[PDB]
Amino acid sequence: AAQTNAPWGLARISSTSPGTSTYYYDESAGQGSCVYVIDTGIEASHPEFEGRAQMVKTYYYSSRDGNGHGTHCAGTVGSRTYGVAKKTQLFGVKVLDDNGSGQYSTIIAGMDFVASDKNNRNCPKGVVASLSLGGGYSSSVNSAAARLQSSGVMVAVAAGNNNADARNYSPASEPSVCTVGASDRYDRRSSFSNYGSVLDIFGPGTDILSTWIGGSTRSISGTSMATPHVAGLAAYLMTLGKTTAASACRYIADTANKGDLSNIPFGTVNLLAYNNYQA
Template structure:
C-alpha cells in the first residue's frame, strides 16, 4: 500500500499587522518586506514538495519474481507460475552474469561501469552488483551470442557467463521414513560420546544454501538463525519443498522430548542458517546468479547493495549442482566467489552429483577449495547414482540400506530419512530421500562437530579438510571414493573408524 501524501498544515488567516494602514499604497520598505514574505512562502512550499518526493520510505509496490509469492511464505497455487523448461546444464533465457577485472571504488562509479559495459553490448542491467559482486544483465535471447562475444572482448570484463540453471541433487524414494542407520553404522554415536556440540562454547553456524527450510519443524526450530531468500528478495525462507529441510536435518537436527530425528551435529551450539536460492514454486529450478549471491550472503559478504547479513557461517553446505558442462566464464565466476569465501576461513562442502557416471563431479563441488562429497550405501560401497571421477574428495552415507528395509516398518527402501518440508503433514513430519545431496550435509555436520570439539580449527578450512581426509575409511580407488568415507568417530579421535 502506498503511503498517503502528507499535506501541509493549514495556516491561520493572516490579519493586517498593527501599524499598517489599509487602503493606501505601501511604502518602499513595506514592498520589500512583502517580497521577502512571498519568497519565504515559496521556499516553504517547495521544501514540502521535495520532502514528499524524496521520502526515505518508498511506496510498497509488490515486485513479482517468477516463481516467488507476492506475500512471503504464501503457497503458490498449481499453475500460478510457469514451470521452467530448462534442464540440468541449461540456462535462464536472456540472462548474463558479468564481472569486472578492477571494479572502481564508490557506488556511482561502479554503477556507471556496469551501465557502460552492458550498453556497449546491447544489454541492460537487471540487477546492479556492488564491489566484486557480478552484475545480472538481460538481452534478447536471439542476440545473446553476439552480446557475449562483444563482452568477451571488452578489456574491462573479467567473466561473462550464461545464468545456468541450478538443480537439487536428491532422488525421492518413498513417503515413509527409516531408522537412522547412517548415524549408528557410520560412527556418529561414538563421536557424540566426545562431542555433540551441546556443551559450553561458541556456536558453530552451518549455512544450508538450498531451497528453503521448514523453520517450524520440532527438530530444528530451536536452532534456526534468521536467514535470507536471495531468489525472491525477502527474509522468508519457508518452503513446502522437502529438500532443504531434509539437508538441514542431516547436518544439524536437534534432539528434544517431542523430536523425531537427530542430525550429525545435534547439539544446541550447532545452529542452522538457511539461505534460499530457489523459487517458492517447487517445480522450478534455481540459477547460478542466485547460488552465487546465496553463498556470498552466508559468508557475510554484501549482495544487492544491502548491508551484509548478521551472521557468518563456519560451514556452508551446497547440495545443489549445475552439471559438469559449465562454461569457463561460469566456473570462473564461481571460483572467484569460492576464493573470496575461503579467504574468510569458511569450510565449503558440496554434493558430487547424481548422474552415476565417471565423467567427474558436478559444479560447484568440482571447484578448488570446495569439498566434493559422493554417496555410499549401508555396506560402504558407492551408491549407483553417485557421480565419480575428477574432483571427488570424500564419501558419506547418502544411499540406501535394503537389507534393513525388510525389518523396518517406516521406509521400505531403507533410504536416508530426516525432517520434511512445511508441505508435509505437521511440524514433526519426516521424509525419505537419497542422493549426494544427503551425503554432503553428513560431512558438513561432521565438520561442525570438529569445530565444536577443537575450536582452534575454526577459520582454517584446509586443516579441517586434512583431518577429514586423513581419518577417512579406505574403500576403493580414488576415482570412485576419493580419500575414503567420512567417519565422525575417527575425525574426533575416538579410536574407531565408523564404529569399527
C-alpha cells in the same frame, strides 16, 4: 553420547564398520558452531530443530521451504534425531525455488551473502556451508565457492547424481571446497553418485531419513544427502577444536575410513567420513 536406533548414516559416521545402528558422538555436539544450508529453505518451526534453525535470506517471494529438500538437508546437519551436530545453529539461505531450481546468478549471490553474513552471527567455534546443489561447469560458480571457502567457511558441496565425473559440474569441480560423493548402507558407492579426482570424501547418501516439511520425516537419496553429513561432521569437529574451516576437509580425509567402499573407480578416493569418536 549414544543415540540408539539412529539413522544408518549417523551410525556409519561414528563406526569403523557398516551394519550398526547406534550413533556415538561427543556431547558438545557442534555447540557454538554455525552451518548455513544454501538450498530451498528450512522449515525452522519443525520440532526437530528445537529453535536452533532460522531463515536468514531468500531470493524469492517467501523464505519458507515449499519443497522439502532444504529441510531434509538441514535435518541431517543438525536436527535432534536425524542430525550429525545436534547443537549447532542452522541458518537457511533460499537460493532454490520451491521446484528445487535456481539460476546460477542467484546461487552465486547466496554464496557471497554467506561469506559476509557470518560476520553478523555468533559462531565462536566456526562456520560451515552446505551446498546440496549444482549444475554444469561454470567458472563463476566455482569462483564463488572458492571465495566463500577463502573467507573462513568450511564449504561442503554435492558431487552430483549423474554417475559421471564431477569435473564437469559446479560447484562440485572447484578444487578448494570439499566435494562429497554418496555411499549406501553396505559401503557401496551409491548408484547415482558422481566420482572422479575432484571428490574429497564420501558420506552416507542412499536411503537417508531426515526432516521434511509439514513437520514430517522421510527417507530420500542423493549426493544432496551425503553433503550435510560432512557439513555437520565439520561443525562437530570444529566445536571440538580438532580442526578449522580452512583445514576441515583435509582433516576429514586424513581421519576417514580408508579403502572400505566398493565400486570406487580407479582414481577416485576411497574415503568415508568418520568422526573417530572414542566413547
